[PDB]
Amino acid sequence: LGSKLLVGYWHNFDNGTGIIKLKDVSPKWDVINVSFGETGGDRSTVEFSPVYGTDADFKSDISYLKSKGKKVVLSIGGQNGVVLLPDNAAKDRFINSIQSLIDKYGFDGIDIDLQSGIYLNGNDTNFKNPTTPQIVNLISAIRTISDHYGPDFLLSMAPETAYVQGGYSAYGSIWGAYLPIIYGVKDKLTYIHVQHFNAGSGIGMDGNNYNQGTADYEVAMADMLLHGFPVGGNANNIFPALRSDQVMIGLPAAPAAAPSGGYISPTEMKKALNYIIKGVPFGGKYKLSNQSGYPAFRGLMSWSINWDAKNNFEFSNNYRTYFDGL
Numbered sequence: 001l002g003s004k005l006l007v008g009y010w011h012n013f014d015n016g017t018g019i020i021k022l023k024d025v026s027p028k029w030d031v032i033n034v035s036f037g038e039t040g041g042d043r044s045t046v047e048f049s050p051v052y053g054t055d056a057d058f059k060s061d062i063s064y065l066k067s068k069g070k071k072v073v074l075s076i077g078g079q080n081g082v083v084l085l086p087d088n089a090a091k092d093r094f095i096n097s098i099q100s101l102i103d104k105y106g107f108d109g110i111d112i113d114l115q116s117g118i119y120l121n122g123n124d125t126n127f128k129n130p131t132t133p134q135i136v137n138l139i140s141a142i143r144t145i146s147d148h149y150g151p152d153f154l155l156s157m158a159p160e161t162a163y164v165q166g167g168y169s170a171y172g173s174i175w176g177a178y179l180p181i182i183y184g185v186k187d188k189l190t191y192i193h194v195q196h197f198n199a200g201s202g203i204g205m206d207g208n209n210y211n212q213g214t215a216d217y218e219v220a221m222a223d224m225l226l227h228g229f230p231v232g233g234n235a236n237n238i239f240p241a242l243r244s245d246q247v248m249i250g251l252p253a254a255p256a257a258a259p260s261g262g263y264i265s266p267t268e269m270k271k272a273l274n275y276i277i278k279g280v281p282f283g284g285k286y287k288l289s290n291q292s293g294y295p296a297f298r299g300l301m302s303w304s305i306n307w308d309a310k311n312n313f314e315f316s317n318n319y320r321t322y323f324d325g326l
């Protein structure tokens with residue numbers, strides 16, 4: 001797996017941007033996050049059927065991409081997905097259903113993209129030792145699934161900012177709720193790409209409020225994971241830095257890909273990237289924690305491959321060229 005990646009979400013559905021068959025996806029994407037595995041009534045058995053092709057056709061298309069060095073990952077959740085693991089029985093249905101899908105289609109890994117049903121209960125105060133069943137069981141399930149496959153099994157996640165960087169402000173309910181998940185699976189985590197969009201403002205480690213879709217915001221939010229940060233206003237409760245090679249930034253491919261804002265122009269984003277990766281500043285207000293950069297910063301994720309194709313391939317062309325050209 002390359003050192004500077006483009007990870008793109010792939011719509012297993014037509015939302016007006018159309019379907020792109022797998023072999024027609026631009027080769028500039030290194031990893032394709034197939035979107036999404038969702039659930040029915042029991043909210044724990046994950047299901048997936050391809051939007052085009054026989055099952056065998058879809059599996060063959062995945063095999064073709066893998067033969068070209070690409071990774072194809074099953075994303076679980078999304079805007080509409082609901083996964084609830086209140087007890088061990090539910091956890092086991094989740095594990096078995098996902099393993100079955102990985103086996104059936106030959107997915108290279110899984111992406112945790114759960115955007116509901118995740119809360120730190122009252123008294124759940126320690127990110128190293130979570131107590132809320134949903135969180136404890138997700139961690140257990142993720143570790144179990146990862147340990148069911150070989151060394152190249154890919155694990156990613158795409159939490160919204162409140163769940164991660166929001167932990168700088170509060171630790172409870174959704175605030176910081178992915179922190180125990182991240183920590184609990186860190187030794188199996190390939191990378192995390194927080195969604196830096198549909199996100200309003202975010203507080204940086206300088207205590208300043210930043211607006212989504214600005215270079216300063218991208219640097220401030222990424223730096224939290226690159227450097228680590230105190231949780232919930234408690235100086236003695238530090239969330240440790242991830243490896244730089246585990247940190248990505250998730251961005252909208254086009255303005256319309258994130259209807260509540262967050263899109264950033266490649267010109268502005270390259271300022272943020274040069275600062276993050278090389279410590280080369282751009283006159284921004286945010287001061288990077290390590291002023292000579294985090295060279296192993298892993299790259300960019302986008303919602304989505306489909307949106308990118310409808311927007312002159314702006315995201316894929318701009319950022320592939322940027323990363324290739326370093």
Ligand SMILES: CC(=O)N[C@@H]1[C@@H](O)[C@H](O[C@@H]2O[C@H](CO)[C@@H](O)[C@H](O)[C@H]2NC(C)=O)[C@@H](CO)O[C@H]1O
Pocket residue numbers: 009015035036077078079080081113158195198250256257258259303
């Ligand atoms: C990274 C990620 O998965 N983001 C979430 C997406 O699911 C969401 O896109 C929306 O997904 C729905 C299915 O879950 C689609 O029905 C819907 O059309 C789609 N919205 C758009 C504008 O493409 C994106 C939207 O920015 O953010 C998260 O909510």
